[PDB]
Design a protein around this ligand. Structure first.
Ligand SMILES: NC(=O)C1=CN([C@@H]2O[C@H](COP(=O)(O)OP(=O)(O)OC[C@H]3O[C@@H](n4cnc5c(N)ncnc54)[C@H](O)[C@@H]3O)[C@@H](O)[C@H]2O)C=CC1
Ligand SMILES: NC(=O)C1=CN([C@@H]2O[C@H](COP(=O)(O)OP(=O)(O)OC[C@H]3O[C@@H](n4cnc5c(N)ncnc54)[C@H](O)[C@@H]3O)[C@@H](O)[C@H]2O)C=CC1
Ligand SMILES: NC(=O)C1=CN([C@@H]2O[C@H](COP(=O)(O)OP(=O)(O)OC[C@H]3O[C@@H](n4cnc5c(N)ncnc54)[C@H](O)[C@@H]3O)[C@@H](O)[C@H]2O)C=CC1
Ligand SMILES: NC(=O)C1=CN([C@@H]2O[C@H](COP(=O)(O)OP(=O)(O)OC[C@H]3O[C@@H](n4cnc5c(N)ncnc54)[C@H](O)[C@@H]3O)[C@@H](O)[C@H]2O)C=CC1
Lengths: 331, 331, 331, 331
């Protein structure tokens, strides 16, 4: 008779089943910043970790396990076999090649498409009803790719997209204005990358259009060069990579934000990568970022943002660049 | 008049001063895991970061700043010069060489005692009233070293100590019992390293003594071999380092735990390294982990744990091993 | 072509089903305090309220809804019909004829039983797989009553019991010691209220047994009179009732603590009311507060606390008296 | 020696001074909802309660104290004497007469102006440097009165104002739209009362002006009748009071959202009661709700919303009925 049976009288034997489980595959910098942010936001009762490097995977899992006393996620599991993934409400894909100093996120597509062909079919086998949240770059195209490979309805295949870019916009907005970013509003849409589109017309504080006040806003005739805010937004990740090697913390927070709206059916509005064929005169299966209502079934709605002539061209230009790569993708 | 003046009528001047400022020294794996845990627990209205590598520091700072939207810490600052550190309530020192595969934490002492000769005087110049939270290894020695250099009273000089070791002990205990670590109680005291002491006396669930239910507990005669749990506690950091190269997440959550007790004046009990000369017949200025009440003034009080004759022996030895290095210390 | 249709493009048809729904029955001071505490702990994606007073019900629900902007609970609903309760994971019963300002918790049992005979089968009808958390006094008797009417297995019928008495115990302990109740350990078990049992043997700080350090602990000879800490555990409840009319905040936080372990499957140990037949010499179907492991299936396990004969006599005296009332009841 | 001495070795004696202390004056329905919200958001290390009913005051203090275990505010005190208020960082004034069914909030001005002449000087005495957060109705006028009696700079005298009303507006707006209020944007300004102003022009989702989508918005010709949302906002408090007797939960969350911005120096923008003399052609010492930036020093900045001609008329009308009551104010 163990110390345990002398101490604990058991009322029910080996019966479980996970209720709010999250999986992250890829325990690199992004994957672990997603994990830690999701754990400290109390979003999962189970967190499963997958990667192809078996020792780093076990070490990252053990490290998190050792801080369980400070957490409210009672089960953390890992392995190279996707059976540890079974019955995930949400699966976050951060595995892949990240970019070099100066490297376009688009240049990583074939290398990442090549590992999505193994990851995506396996994620679906053990979690057929999950929402798929793609973070690996180029995020817009790999969401499209994950949607094609999985067979999932498009509402359940979501891309990181421009939640981060818009967060960066709002941080820079608040910096200029001496206001917290929560009370600074402005949206960066389209490709999470060089061709992203700032929607100047919807930029506002407490409901007052900055464009209306300051008509030159977002143009080259602008004496204050607010165009430079969206420039910093584009260039920010290149700067961070150059400075520290890679970005991780912000995207982890960004992904935790999306997880939270999904895991908790909040029906909040985020700009995420979704299939936009049909709007602004795009006739192809292009994925890019528009504001979407996120909840327990993924994307249930899209906000039809009205754009100026020029904004619409910029957004279609972004879709043209994107679809060109999608066209000759092979998988 | 700028777009900002049309938007915002200003009433107030320049009145700053941080009220709940925390500084982290060193933005490596451990420093940044501390930063992220403190930001997600809202312990601070201002976080400052310092490191000798300007590069890395600016990039970590920016990465954090890009996530401000998802946080409630309105100022993240950094710099090579410790004037960004001014008026911190809590300075967390994580700078320094870490251990290689198999290397003892004690083998780092001279390398990091050298780093501390530059860091500590700079820290105290700009925050004379701060609490010092030492993380760099060997944490027991460097807390002594940091107290000798600073001139601070012992209550404001704190080593992270055995808070992590106990969190690891509780975790494995709960792993054996099927109970959450929050409800499994056991203390690992002394050196945060190979000579730590597990207090079988006060190992309990719901207030029932495990030792009493099982007098062989923590004994070579023990058929359940519980002392293996403490062996896994000693061995765990080495195993994590062997698996992933370092450790970060659990110590980051362990620091935030201690920061929270300190920042919120909770007077919770933690096993932290402090000056224990006077207790258990230790007549030298040895620092090591004993249970302490932590609040707005650092360590205000000590819990005089009742020790077996043997546990007292192992702890008195843990001291001797530690004082062995302390006496031969030059700075 | 509504504004909504202009602004939003829909993707998902009917959709929905609450995933982590909680129901509170009874919206007096207690039921509403549970409600606000669960809401502020982000415990449910849907909160349902039910009572017989339709006016107060709609108004309490509306008051909560007007605060939705500051919450992370997207659906708040209420009704006299239990259809609003469908698919609750947890249902908290606070309804009653609130036990008179003075008399214990017995002369009115049957009146509350008649209320349960209406409430319980409606609850079970729309959420046959829920856990049931009973707060109504007398909690130990009415938890038994909910078990009889519901037909639920015992693991799924949990009385609030002595979680709150113990919480009061650890507050009073920490006030004496100058330590946060979080780090003050001690258990009050048995009948919630007048006959509750303070297990002096488990009272410890940081693993140090206060009874062993201080043998007079719990005796009437005790020059420090630690007996009085438990007397105040009982009488302070009366004092608050006498002072403000009733209690609410403390019990509300307690219930949300239990809800937290349950909804998040933490497997923390709490002293709640469970069918205790087969332990400490008790042979009648009775519920008493025992340390219990709470998780997604309710009470899965139970800690068998070593008790003195003296202590054990009180539990069986309490079990004797409870079962006596129970066989006179009509239901 | 005592058991406390045998257990705890004391290092520091001297210790005292709260750093993030909050006082609530008035422990009625509102005040308690305020305290409990503040407690569960961990905004304070010291909470002080004040009232004139010594029984109700003590029982609420104790009821809160019994939940200490579940909280992170280690000091909860109360007294009829204001020395317990000493050195509060924020004082929240909720005492006074509330409105019976149908009663206008302005009809409480004389009774409550009398109560302030007692409270405010006592408060100012013991916390000369504190922020004053006024909730007592009529909140706009009583904020003026508090400011007059106190002699504080106008940045440190804030009325809860239309934070609650705008929250209600965004709840109703989201309800019609199928979107969380966090993502629904709209401002109700001016008097917290019958004459509040909805700024239709800034109502938006993801920066899409709804007035531009639906130019009949807010107009009587609007055949979707959106101006019924503002009517509901005006009437909501009358309906809730008719239904449950009073409002408490939503205002407590509103006050907690304001306290958070203040105690954490977030510089979020909230619509609160401030002095608007000189704006929108208002030449008197009128206090009503405009978008303010809230932080550690109270209101540091004001947002100049572009009001349409009708909207500007409505706002000056709202100010002139406020002034006619202020004008006739003897004190
Ligand atoms: N959408 C956004 O805003 C962000 C996108 N990213 C992208 O995330 C991806 C990963 O970034 P990092 O974490 O910094 O790289 P990393 O090199 O630190 O980690 C990537 C991990 O993926 C694992 N991996 C490679 N192939 C795998 C496969 N078939 N299956 C499972 N795991 C596999 C690797 O072992 C590695 O641990 C990159 O594409 C990066 O560009 C990075 C920053 C944020
Ligand atoms: N007490 C505990 O439980 C644990 C302590 N540690 C110790 O923390 C320390 C750091 O570990 P890691 O973050 O992984 O190392 P790391 O290599 O990732 O980062 C160390 C940082 O310190 C900086 N550094 C070196 N000399 C400096 C100097 N004079 N001034 C300012 N910065 C300087 C470095 O630039 C680097 O950014 C080590 O001593 C490690 O042993 C690590 C894990 C747990
Ligand atoms: N377990 C514990 O630690 C404590 C238990 N309690 C008990 O909780 C219960 C509630 O206490 P209070 O809210 O303060 O009293 P209360 O009388 O204000 O609330 C009881 C509510 O249940 C409603 N009710 C009566 N019959 C109902 C029925 N068929 N269906 C739905 N609702 C019905 C009533 O309308 C009332 O709103 C009482 O029995 C009290 O003795 C109170 C505090 C401590
Ligand atoms: N601005 C807003 O949105 C909100 C404003 N209110 C207002 O809050 C105020 C109170 O509402 P309730 O709490 O429901 O009323 P209540 O009657 O439940 O409690 C009011 C408390 O103020 C106490 N009091 C009277 N004179 C006092 C004095 N010199 N010093 C200290 N305490 C004193 C009373 O004893 C009572 O405890 C009213 O003016 C109400 O209209 C109510 C809801 C929200």
């Amino acid at each position: 008779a163990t110390l345990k049976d002398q101490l604990i009288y058991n009322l029910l034997k080996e019966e479980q089943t996970p209720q709010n489980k999250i999986t992250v595959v890829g325990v690199g910098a992004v994957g672990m910043a997603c994990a830690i942010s999701i754990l400290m936001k109390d979003l999962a009762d189970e967190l499963a970790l997958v990667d192809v490097i078996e020792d780093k995977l076990k070490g990252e899992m053990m490290d998190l396990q050792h801080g369980s006393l400070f957490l409210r996620t009672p089960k953390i599991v890992s392995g190279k076999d996707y059976n540890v993934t079974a019955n995930s409400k949400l699966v976050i894909i951060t595995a892949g090649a990240r970019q070099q100093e100066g490297e376009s996120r688009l240049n990583l597509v074939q290398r990442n498409v090549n590992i999505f062909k193994f990851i995506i079919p396996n994620v679906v086998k053990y979690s057929p009803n999950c929402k798929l949240l793609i973070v690996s770059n180029p995020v817009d195209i790999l969401t499209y790719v994950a949607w094609k490979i999985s067979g999932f309805p498009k509402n359940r295949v979501i891309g990181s997209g421009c939640n981060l870019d818009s967060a960066r916009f709002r941080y820079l907005m608040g910096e200029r204005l001496g206001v917290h970013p929560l009370s600074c509003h402005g949206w960066v849409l389209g490709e999470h990358g060089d061709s992203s589109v700032p929607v100047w017309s919807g930029m506002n504080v407490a409901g007052v259009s900055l464009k209306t006040l300051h008509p030159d806003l977002g143009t080259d005739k602008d004496k204050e060069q607010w165009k430079e805010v969206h420039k910093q937004v584009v260039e920010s990740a290149y700067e961070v990579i150059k400075l520290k090697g890679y970005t991780s913390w912000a995207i982890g927070l960004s992904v935790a934000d999306l997880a939270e709206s999904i895991m908790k059916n909040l029906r909040r509005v985020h700009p995420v990568s979704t299939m936009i064929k049909g709007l602004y005169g795009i006739k192809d299966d292009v994925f890019l970022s528009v504001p979407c209502i996120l909840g327990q079934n993924g994307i249930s709605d899209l906000v039809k943002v009205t754009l100026t002539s020029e904004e619409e061209a910029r957004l279609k230009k972004s879709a043209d660049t994107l679809w060109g790569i999608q066209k000759e993708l092979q998988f």
